[PDB]
Amino acid sequence: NAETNEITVGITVTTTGPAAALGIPERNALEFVAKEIGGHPIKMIVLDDGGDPTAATTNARRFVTESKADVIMGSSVTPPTVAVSNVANEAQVPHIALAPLPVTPERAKWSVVMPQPIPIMGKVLYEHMKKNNIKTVGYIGYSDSYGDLWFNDLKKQGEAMGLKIVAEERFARPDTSVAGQVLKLVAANPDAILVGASGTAAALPQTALRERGYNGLIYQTHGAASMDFIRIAGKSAEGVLMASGPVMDPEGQNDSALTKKPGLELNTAYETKYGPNSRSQFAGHSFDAFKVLERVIPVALKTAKPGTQEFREAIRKALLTEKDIAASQGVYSFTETDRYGLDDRSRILLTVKNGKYVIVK
């Protein structure tokens, strides 16, 4: 509980296994965040969790008892993120989630969330469906809490907008085949299919549906928004509709948009190192986590020094009072009950034409 010069940020991300497509750009983006805030050096401890809730628990606990982190960030996908948020809330350490999660009362005090809440992304997808004469919808998503969040949104927001769910299928993150589920979707013959998945796994139902002769519209979530989806899906990605944060298109934003400068900053640096169109949803989240810390840390430093519980508490209170935090993915304002803090400025709609993401206006 004693004072340190450095600010210690423990980061657990998924750089191996099925979800490496999400964690790798999150870790890469750390090369472009602030190295010092308010005079204090940032010390980052970056760990791999392989996407596994047990490993992510182990890492978050290390951050509490060994590293004595001031802030914890992660994970890259929903199940390990639930695990990190549980640890951070029990231990009373500020936590920035890099994947969506169900923020229950038990998780709300110490966690805020960078990715867009599912219903914000669902709204744009369902409004495109309605505009395009889609009535019946089939669903295929993970058999875990991320897949549940999306299907829940489809049932609640989707149906309230006139849509009819005619089929629900699930698969597991490591599965290499979705043959059985795809055969059921083709048999139900919905007007459109929504896929609830992420990274390279989102390309699995994409290719499988096209291969089995489904020609209807396919809709993807913001978990699929990087170059990896197109690389794996290939031709089967053409004409896909996909929710995404504004970081995929800073060039297209108004000069006035608060998200423009941060998006241009991150993408200029990221894509200079990693090549044209290497921008991703996921790189946006870890970069934005540091945009938030640039705002809240100098405030916290007014009442306490790094390495103390008083500092963690001052960070938590600053997240409530520092408003309109400009970032690459949106403009953040959190409250005691709103831990995502985002509005209409945090979403766009993409499609794919000739292997490139294209904005849908």
Ligand X SMILES: O=C(O)C(=O)Cc1ccc(O)cc1
Starting at the earlier edge strand, list the strands of the sheet with 217-220.
164-171, 136-142, 192-196, 217-220, 241-244, 348-353, 356-359
Task: Please select the residue that binds ligand X; options are 96, 99, 203, 247, rule is CB under 6 A.
Answer: 99
Size of the site for ligand X (CB under 6 A): 13
- Residue among 174 and 213 whose Cβ is closer to ligand X: 174
Least distance between ligand X and beta carbon 146 (Å): 3
Task: Please select the residue that binds ligand X; options are 37, 42, 56, 77, rule is CB under 6 A.
Answer: 77
Least distance between ligand X and beta carbon 98 (Å): 7
> What separation in angstroms does the CA of 160 have from each of 92, 135, 148?
38, 12, 18
Contact region with ligand X (CB under 6 A), list: 62-70, 84-92, 277-285, 300-308: 277-285
- Residue among 316 and 347 whose Cβ is closer to ligand X: 347
- Of 23-52, binders to ligand X (CB under 6 A) are none
Contact 63, 55 (CB under 8 A): no
Task: Please select the residue that binds ligand X; options are 111, 198, 220, 226, rule is CB under 6 A.
Answer: 198
334-343, long-range: CB < 8 A, 24+ apart = 334/112, 336/108, 337/108, 339/103, 339/107, 339/108, 339/111, 339/112, 339/113, 340/103, 340/112, 340/113, 340/116, 340/117, 340/120, 341/112, 342/116, 342/117, 342/120
Measure the CA–CA gap between 234 and 27, rounded to whole angstroms. 26
Measure the CA–CA gap between 84 and 64, rounded to whole angstroms. 11
Least distance between ligand X and beta carbon 79 (Å): 7
Binding string, residues 133-172; x marks residues near ligand X by CB under 6 A: -------------x--------------------------
Residues 6+ apart with CB under 8 A from 229: 199, 200, 202, 203, 206, 220, 237
Contact 49, 75 (CB under 8 A): yes
- Residue among 77 and 266 whose Cβ is closer to ligand X: 77
- Residue among 22 and 350 whose Cβ is closer to ligand X: 22
- Residue among 8 and 111 whose Cβ is closer to ligand X: 111
Q: Is 115 in the site for ligand X (CB under 6 A)?
A: yes
Tokens, residue 94: 């500020």
Task: Please select the residue that binds ligand X; options are 25, 50, 223, 307, rule is CB under 6 A.
Answer: 223
Q: Is 78 in the site for ligand X (CB under 6 A)?
A: yes
The structure tokens 């050096």 sit at: 41
- Residue among 74 and 306 whose Cβ is closer to ligand X: 74
Least distance between ligand X and beta carbon 262 (Å): 16
Task: Please select the residue that binds ligand X; options are 22, 69, 82, 208, rule is CB under 6 A.
Answer: 22
Contact region with ligand X (CB under 6 A), list: 129-137, 281-289, 292-300, 341-349: 281-289
Name the residue type at position 73: M
What is the binding site for ligand X (CB under 6 A)?
Answer: 22, 77-78, 99-100, 115, 146, 198, 222-223, 281-282, 285
